[PDB]
């Protein structure tokens, strides 16, 4: 009975919780793993452009520099990923 958009959003929460530790936050190695497992085609596109997304994603998204990715920071990362697919649909090359 949930819609597709609702299922999609709930899905990101459960994805998140696949990788958190007991503090409900994601550490650097867990985040790179989350990315390889859940966005391998996104990453591949970047690589083909000469961009290694995982070299700096943790440092870019760990805005408060506590060496963890919290939920708000996780959402911001999903935002960056969404934004690239949005740009592409408007014709930009991927990972622009």
Residues 41-80, one symbol each (x = binds a copy of itself by CB under 8 A, - = not), give xx----------------------------xx--x--xx-
User: Which token pair is 36?
Assistant: 């390889």
Q: Closer to a copy of itself by CB, 78 or 93: give it.
A: 78
8 binds a copy of itself (CB under 8 A): yes
Say if residue 58 is exposed, middle or buried (CB neighbours under 10 Å; 0-12, 13-18, 19+): buried
Q: Closer to Zn ion by CB, 24 or 47: give it.
A: 24
24 binds Zn ion (CB under 5 A): yes
Structural contact between residues 33 and 15, judged by C-beta atoms closer than 8 angstroms: no
């Amino acid at each position: 009975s949930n819609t597709q958009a609702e299922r999609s959003i709930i899905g990101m929460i459960d994805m998140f919780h696949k990788y958190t530790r007991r503090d409900d936050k994601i550490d650097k190695p867990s985040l790179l793993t989350m990315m390889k497992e859940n966005f391998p085609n996104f990453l591949s596109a970047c690589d083909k452009k000469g961009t290694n997304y995982l070299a700096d994603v943790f440092e870019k998204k760990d805005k408060n520099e506590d060496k963890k990715i919290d939920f708000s920071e996780f959402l911001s990362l999903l935002g960056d990923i969404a934004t690239d697919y949005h740009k592409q649909s408007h014709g930009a090359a991927p990972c622009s």
